[PDB]
């Protein structure tokens, strides 16, 4: 029902400049989606992703994954799946594609680009950052108050990383042209994890994928790609499956490396798992891991080195099996994915690696996400985020509504400390409600920060807030 | 006279195991060079590259480029050049290539893999780090002494990161099997930037590219790829050109971002440069930058934002021009590169972007490399490295020659602090001289450390060295 | 008028020089700002200053100098030429409008605006505001100084209010010590019997006390009184 020509649209939102000369051409024999990948890679938020943590602290020299490393791994897995689709399963998947589209250069580049940018706008301090901002907005934007009675403010009471990522990649650049990185329609369409807003009440997607401010942009993307509300781009399923596989496997690897568990602990957990006792993929992975572990034990290795090698081989085998299962599932259900009324929640659940991935997620939650150190760090990050949000709100509230409670010197300094692009977007005259604009400015300010930068700003403003507090 | 079939050899050094069932296959429809890129990406040193610095400190939240970001940018540029070669200039570049080789999947993957791993084995604290090591090896391995009189010890007196990178990817893995990551012959051949040893005296290459311990491995690579001593793989020129372009442009960008200079300063430096006054590439870049800077000045931006965006446009123009020039130069001189007696020093010199790259390097050296803060940090890193090397040599010296000066408790402790794989390699019975083995152990230990890890280890050992020092 | 014009010229030029020296901008940045300024594109004084600066900068670039040294020399020559041009313009304007200045109903706002160096001085002021006055470090220091001043003023007001009106809320030991810490001449003027309102006298005493302080002295006094204010606060 949905044609690949529209889904792989290489046009961009910004109108083409007719004054450009041949000397200003920058493509240099590159496909448009490859240019999108290059734009994402060379963006400042991509580099700042290194300073933002993923699960565990990033300053312990334990080679744990950060946002940048996780994004690169997801991009690599998506690129590999794209190579498989465009070089082996072209006939099965891309049945009707115009000759003007080079699948072998576009599909891998598109998958890599959407994988690399999938977690670009998430708040710092992991998922606890988004949770903390959601709690702060719920407390400071009460639903019973007439100013925030509207459901649109749910965009902040249930703050999502994906909506902020779309806003950042589309509107939050230095130039205020509502075009951002000016990615192709295919990349923007594939980037939308949840094609619905908080105003909508879709039961298929629990979260919302875009803010109220980006509603027109998302409508344009849907119009230029043949999609609609509630319908997810076919490559978004691949990107989500790759993200799930990557985080589930590499978080277990990081847990083993950090000493919170051991390779034998993971093997026993998978073997004793209720759904993994009879799963073929899990059985094959366990058999391969044990076979390699015997040979490794034959050699001379320290216990930590043996654990590391066994974990590495487990990662290799699990990633291979899960990627193969995901590719097979996508190939088998390609017609349903291309259907205009697709209702598949995720690609992994339709594959044979569902049980293994679910067991890995459970192991990561039980061993790593609920670890005492991780919980303490999450609480510290929540305190930092909430304190900084209160301090910034002291200098933001009333700036658009009309009240002058921000005119204190601390308020003016705090407002000046926010990045210039965010303030420029906030001061622009549009149809958004004033309270919505203030809350969006605060969310944009906090979301773009890294852990170290957020902590430093919080400490600095706490030092400068002493007089006003008393 | 060299053939692309040998240069793109996808075989690996490790003998292919015969007792492997189909259930243990992890290729999953991947080309071997793609698996090489995946192995490089998922390796622990690749993740640890984020903690290693390139020019400027990492703790500042200015989004300056680390070793990981620089390697990823180099890999992206090499991948783009490979896509251009395999999709547009296939007839001009690749002739008499076997149908078994899939150029469209191998060439971009090979270039990306060699770009990503090009700086995996460099010592921390930037280039000065390696320099510092050389100084230490010059003092503690005196040339006039009979023990260290042979030229092979020059391998440490002129320590270079490329030889250590080759050793890391070939031997310095946890599993001691002399195969390392088991990369393909094409990747290993393209990785060797300087195809000569310290003992060999060649006027073509300034530095050596491999240690004495890797002489047999390099000979095997040359035998299996058709190369020889002093002959460089054709893709190594592309990788080196991409590395030069990336560092020269992005170091200027980081200098401007850090505030050590401004966009107008760079424009004036390029315009007033003796060789860039009449250079076509430099003139075009300056014209495009000014044309876009006028339009950007039409809008309302802060001076910092204007500088940042103007230099962003400068980057997107200069990188495009330099990449196009490098591709054209490689296409034109392909016969000379394929010759068994190639003498070209670098690809950029043969290109038309030579003057712009030279001017950018001069600007980086004058403004960023010789800045006061960078010099102070380099001195601190040199002090840290030399102190740690002294403390480690206290526990390494005599471990192989036969002396017992290491038997002190501090010596045993610092020997135990070194990673187990390095000690396993050092204790293995081989033909290397004992002094060479000790020096190699120290070099492998120091090179594999990150900045923060090196500082922490130095401080800890200094704390523990108090009793024996007195 | 002459004093105000000299003050304007001095601060506008030397603040730009200090901005360049401190690294917040560069000589080429200032040259581009002046050249691209709307009112300085056709101003004769600005054109002459830019031409002289470029002519001297070429010769300086011929010599061997570090980038910081080249910036410093170019800034010094810009200061020399701009100061000369602005002073000459101010003198000419004062000489031409001397009768209006001596008029009993003079309505001239400033001497620079009547001179030919008006555009250059205005552009220099805009450059100083955009680069130096709104710099992040300057804003943070301004906020710190504001906090220090307001805290010290509250602490001193604790020991001043009511001293002349009649209320005895100052009789706490901290209030008496704070009053004793103020300079003797200010207190002697405040205690003098005159026709000023009591609240006006108290406010004037506080203003005289704070205004005569320096940065280091104000910070030290604020810290000392904060240390001595712990018991009264609780
Ligand atoms: N610190 C911490 N992180 C968690 C926890 N649970 C999940 N995470 C992390 C791991 C994953 O990156 C991610 C998993 O959450 P989701 O799968 O729901 O991600 P998202 O909603 O963005 O899209 P998705 O469901 O993957 O399609 O958050 C937890 O309990 N504690
Ligand atoms: N901190 C610091 N870094 C430098 C300095 N000079 C160069 N670098 C940076 C730039 C490069 O990424 C790298 C050295 O560049 P080179 O081209 O000279 O390296 P190499 O001799 O291996 O030749 P090649 O890269 O193959 O063209 O370190 C310096 O003086 N101080
Ligand atoms: N920290 C800071 N200082 C400023 C700023 N704007 C002006 N200044 C400084 C520079 C000058 O010394 C002086 C400029 O203010 P005025 O020209 O109004 O001085 P004033 O009113 O005393 O008399 P005048 O106008 O010169 O005749 O204050 C600012 O935005 N931040
Ligand atoms: Mg993710
Ligand atoms: Mg490099
Ligand atoms: Mg003055």
Author numbering:
A (entry chain A), B (entry chain B): 0 to 469
C (entry chain J): 236 to 469
Q: How is this structure described in the published paper?
A:
Together these results demonstrate that CloA is a dGTPase effector that senses phage infection by specifically responding to elevated dTTP concentrations associated with viral replication. Clover defense encodes an accessory enzyme CloB that synthesizes an additional nucleotide signal p3diT that suppresses CloA activation and protects uninfected cells from aberrant nucleotide depletion. p3diT binds to CloA in an allosteric site adjacent to the dTTP binding pocket and raises the threshold of intracellular dNTP levels required to trigger full Clover immune activation.
To define the mechanism of nucleotide signaling in Clover anti-phage defense, we mutated the Salmonella CloA active site (H126A/E129A) to allow direct comparison of dGTP substrate interactions and determined cryo-EM structures of CloA in the suppressed CloA–dGTP–p3diT (2.6 Å) or activated CloA–dGTP–dTTP (2.6 Å) states. Remarkably, the CloA–dGTP–p3diT and CloA–dGTP–dTTP structures reveal that p3diT and dTTP each bind at the CloAAB interface in structurally distinct sites that remodel to accommodate the inhibiting or activating nucleotide signals. In the CloA–dGTP–p3diT suppressed state structure, p3diT is bound at the CloAAB interface in a pocket formed by helices α2A, α4B, α14B, and loop α1A–α2A that seals around the inhibitory nucleotide signal. Specificity for p3diT binding is mediated by CloA residues that make base-specific contacts with the Watson-Crick edges of the first thymidine base T1 (Q311B) and second thymidine base T2 (D37A and N75B). However, in the p3diT-bound suppressed state, the dGTP substrate is coordinated by comparatively minimal interactions between CloA residues that contact the guanosine nucleobase (Y246A and Q377A) and β- and γ-phosphates (Y193A, D243A, and K206A). In the p3diT bound suppressed state, interactions with the inhibitory nucleotide signal stabilize CloA loop α8A–α9A in an open conformation that is drawn away from the dTTP-binding site.
